[PDB]
Design a protein around this ligand. Structure first.
Ligand SMILES: [Mn+2]
Ligand SMILES: [Mn+2]
Ligand SMILES: [Mn+2]
Ligand SMILES: [Mn+2]
Lengths: 205, 205, 205, 205
């Protein structure tokens, strides 16, 4: 029994399916959003509906079973929503580095010395992921807004109340396979050319 | 916003806190039910209440965070509820083996040859558990009601719609530490002297 | 310090890269074996070499870190080795069902009633997998050689001494994406047309 | 085939079994070291011996199975070794806070404002742990030696080459049950009265 202000939907994306070429093919973006993300949107909504029913009648065997789907689709929708938002065509700023005069920029130089180095780290983490997963540049609000590079598995997302996702990078094969196939190393590097750091600076404050 | 027919409570136990001695001390049973299980009952109820709120306003970061607690307390309540139900004083049948003429009994002799052997297996699994967890004798309804011995971690419980828990055995230290301390091997053996197989036969049908 | 009889290598495959069309494209088989499996072969070998070094000098921080890679590449090599072996061109028997007069065949009809039904189950499990993973039809030797359908995550493999993998099915996107993309449901169905049941019957004894 | 410089042993502890009272009973310390830690020491050694054998003959099914035990006992030995080292009798400094003039001290005030607050955080994390696990105050060397409070499950330990454990706190029930039973909240608070911050400052450099 999912209600109006409970259900989610696919977000409006601020760029064209081909606006990220030649770094990300429109064939991927098409399938990824409209195919993969749509599946998560449907999954979360159906999972919530299934809960009001199972919970509504004290069936914990089902309640516990449905939990997984909610973590998966709910985290999937969240991750991809973050993903599109920190992506932009080179035209609209994509690939433009954080300002040496911005809060986020100064923080990267203090902890990592340069945005360049932070990328080598994030890329190493991404290449490290075994199976499906994500990489994040997170801000920890409980230890003085310190930045860190964290890796989640599958659809898991930054859910800790004190953690705030700054940049999300998809490591699922579906994200890069049609264009890069096995060579995920090329995809990890290339994607920085379309990363919307303006959104990162926005999230940092 | 947890409602009446949604919230759970502590189940009525069919034996006295000392009725399982000298296999399980009343000091343990007291703390375990009234202390550990009570904590799970409170946890599940608060977790559900927290959902109607987070879900009610499309806050997936919280929705995903709360998921874990629901799996934990909800699975904890379920496991312990199963646990008390397959425990009984030697007086009330505890420790009495499955009938060689019952469905469950015949199934144990077909797959394991004897209840004796099934116990050595279950005990080996229990001793195998690293950290907190449970052991189960489950009936798989999708492959001809075949029995199997499975091990879950922490509060995880048999949630698969086709799987049916026949016997639950707690492997958490809290279950046996006050009386057996480190020697979990003694606890695993001794507990069979108070296992209510009558409840197992009940669950098998 | 990995030695001769310790190191692994890519197995000789008994069919041509295109012998499984139009169910599995040669473009996939090429990349999968020669690209994905090769990566696992290299991974396991390097992981073992790294151990003799870390273990050789009581560096448990590294020893524990290397453990993961050994589970991953070692399990990856094992899974794919099983995968090729239970695949065959329709010509060489691929897609031919288990004999109603064979041990494995009779076991499928006893537990599942028909090979047909066992496939619907395995397909449901495969579709259930969240993220990367595998599906297996396993024989449990400790409960009377009973068959069951189990799902592992990532490169995890059937390692339990009492469990024996009968059929392995890859659920990683890399296995089916180039040809089926998102529609994994089509891949799961189609792959049965090239499953080598003769190898399954071989493994069952 | 475990060799001399490969095998581990129980470390020499710098305090008496009762030197931590009334915060940690000697009954616990006895059982914990000599009972729990000893079990891990034996586990790691046997696990390594079992590897030289399985690996020595390309049996990956066993190699992958043994991996888990090595992660568990190897991580268990590491965690407890860290644990004793950051524990001390109030006499020998236990409970004495980090110097406002030391590197570690200044870092705690910059990120957390006070050691007091860092403890409330660590305690919240510890209380958050579901099942068996540990809590750590770690120094990340790849982002400017920033401090963070992390929680591992079971015997998992800080293995990341860039992470350095500063303080380890055991969250297993065996650590506090005999004296505090269920009330882990009391144990988490009380243990700070015997935490050896001098060792933390040592690890920070
Ligand atoms: Mn994706
Ligand atoms: Mn319990
Ligand atoms: Mn594969
Ligand atoms: Mn311990």
């Amino acid at each position: 029994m999912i209600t109006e202000n409970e259900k989610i939907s696919l977000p409006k994306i601020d760029w064209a399916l081909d606006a990220l070429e030649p770094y990300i093919s429109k064939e991927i973006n098409d399938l990824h959003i409209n195919k993969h993300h749509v599946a998560y949107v449907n999954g979360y909504n159906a999972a919530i509906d299934a809960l009001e029913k199972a919970v509504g009648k004290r069936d914990l065997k089902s309640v516990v079973e449905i939990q997984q789907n909610i973590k998966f689709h709910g985290g999937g929708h969240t991750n991809h929503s973050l993903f599109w938002k920190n992506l932009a065509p080179v035209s609209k700023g994509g690939g433009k580095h954080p300002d040496t005069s911005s809060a986020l920029g100064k923080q990267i130089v203090a902890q990592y010395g340069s945005v360049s180095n932070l990328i080598d780290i994030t890329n190493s983490k991404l290449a490290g992921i075994q199976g499906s997963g994500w990489a994040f540049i997170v801000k920890n609000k409980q230890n003085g807004g310190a930045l860190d590079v964290v890796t989640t598995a599958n659809q898991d997302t930054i859910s800790a109340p004190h953690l705030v996702p700054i940049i999300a990078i998809d490591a699922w094969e579906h994200a890069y396979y049609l264009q890069y196939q096995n060579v995920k190393l090329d995809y990890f590097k290339a994607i920085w050319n379309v990363i919307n750091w303006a959104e990162a600076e926005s999230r940092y404050s």
